[PDB]
């Protein structure tokens, strides 16, 4: 019936004075736009069909054409920012928000989806969706005693669209919109479906990606323990956003970092720092670096959980970017730690993998490492054991690499190197 029409036939049907002919043509458009290989989005836009679809969204008397037009417009809005803009410019936003009230759940769902694509374009369309009043009717759809009574596809779409209203920066979402949405995110974060949980963690990870005030809004809602629990999930689509959220939170104040520690996050990091997915290992090492930048009692909890040998491990062998995060974790540790903690770090074997990384072609990591070596030499000075440390660096081949760096290109490198040789290797 409606399989593989031409754009010309769709146009002729939508321009007929016959609601049923329009409905068949609109469904044909939906099927064209639903095919996976090169949907003719631009031809549909050039044919002037968007204003027609938008008007069909408002035909309460004909719910099937509401659905078909909602689906067609959803897939146009899923394209480039220029294609999403065409949908917005046709007035789709208020029309989709009206459809959130629809008594047909498959139509309400499609309006949820479309608004997610529009909001997902970026900050401007996200805030415009919010200004048109989308948040109240979206949250109303979740005002049930038990989320389990909703179809899980429906619930996944809602969670995903909410996550897009939490997404993006410059600017971040309006504070009052974030406060409005957070209680529902907290509830969704306790729902058993893996996809809902993942999308909820993504939303939280967006909201914690910013200044300390934004982090605080989230931490104050009490979700850190649930995030730590989700950090231990077996589904990697859950672990990835949960870990990103935890990592964002520990970029905050030392008190916010402490709530991640108190919730038990450090117990999960033996697995995360050896995780076979390179992105998880990198994000976990980054997170560790922002914990070793904290107080001495927080460094001490990293020590107590046995995580220093795991940092030595990733420094010794991992993807290069992970190793660079490990280098940072060590430079922060040595910068803020006590003498005892630095002594312990050396006893765990940090020196050799640290030197081995001076061979790398990345001048920033060379700076980070040289800074770490100075910090350790300073702790040795305080113990009068500068010489044991010089001997240890020399035996593993580190001296060779440091003089090689006397004649390095970057100026910060060669001045830090010379200083080290002048002072400790005379």
């Amino acid at each position: 019936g409606t399989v593989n029409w031409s754009v010309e036939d769709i146009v002729k049907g939508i321009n007929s004075n016959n609601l049923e002919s329009q409905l068949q043509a609109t469904q044909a458009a939906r099927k064209l736009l639903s095919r996976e290989k090169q949907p003719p989005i631009d031809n549909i836009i050039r044919a002037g069909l968007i204003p027609k679809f938008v008007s069909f969204l408002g035909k309460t008397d004909c719910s099937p054409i509401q659905f078909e037009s909602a689906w067609a417009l959803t897939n146009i809005a899923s394209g480039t920012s220029e294609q999403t803009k065409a949908v917005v410019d046709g007035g789709a936003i208020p029309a989709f928000i009206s459809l959130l009230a629809s008594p047909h759940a498959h139509i309400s769902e499609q309006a949820v989806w479309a608004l997610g694509n529009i909001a997902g374009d970026g900050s401007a369309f996200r805030d415009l969706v919010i200004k048109h009043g989308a948040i109240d009717p979206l949250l109303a759809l979740l005002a049930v005693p038990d989320l389990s009574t909703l179809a899980c596809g429906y619930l996944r779409n809602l969670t995903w669209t909410l996550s897009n209203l939490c997404r993006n920066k410059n600017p971040a979402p309006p504070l009052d919109a974030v406060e409005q949405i957070l209680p529902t995110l907290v509830r969704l974060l306790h729902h058993n479906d893996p996809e809902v949980l993942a999308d909820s963690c993504w939303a939280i990870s967006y909201l914690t990606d910013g200044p300390n005030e934004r982090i605080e809004m989230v931490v104050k809602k009490g979700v850190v323990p649930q995030l730590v629990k989700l950090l231990g999930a077996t589904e990697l689509p859950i672990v990835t956003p949960a870990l990103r959220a935890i990592g964002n939170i520990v970029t905050g104040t030392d008190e916010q970092t402490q709530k991640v520690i108190d919730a038990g996050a450090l117990a999960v990091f033996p697995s995360l720092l050896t995780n076979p997915k390179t992105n998880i290992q990198k994000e976990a090492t980054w997170t560790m670096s922002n914990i070793t930048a904290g107080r001495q009692d927080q460094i001490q909890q990293v020590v107590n959980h046995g995580l220093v040998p795991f940092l030595v491990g990733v420094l010794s062998k991992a993807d290069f970017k992970t190793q660079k995060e490990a280098a940072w974790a060590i430079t922060n540790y040595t910068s803020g730690g006590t003498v005892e903690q630095i002594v312990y770090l050396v006893h765990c074997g940090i020196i050799e993998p640290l030197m081995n990384l001076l061979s790398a072609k990345d001048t920033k990591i060379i700076q980070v490492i040289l800074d770490a070596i100075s910090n350790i030499f300073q702790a040795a000075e305080k113990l009068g054991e500068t010489e044991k440390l010089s001997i240890m660096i020399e035996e593993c081949g580190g001296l060779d690499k440091i003089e090689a760096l006397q004649r390095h290109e970057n100026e910060s490198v060669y001045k830090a190197s010379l200083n080290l040789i002048e002072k400790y290797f005379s």
């Binding site: 736009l33 639903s34 095919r35 996976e36 949907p39 689906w71 959803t74 897939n75 809005a77 899923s78 394209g79 999403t84 499609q110 989806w113 997610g116 694509n117 997902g120 374009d121 996944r156 779409n157 969670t159 995903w160 996550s163 897009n164 997404r167 996809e195 993942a198 999308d199 993504w202 689509p237 956003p241």
Partner: peptide, 10 residues
């Protein structure tokens, strides 16, 4: 869904 910012309905 997950971290996709846009997605069509196939």
């Amino acid at each position: 869904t997950l971290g996709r910012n846009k997605r069509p309905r196939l």
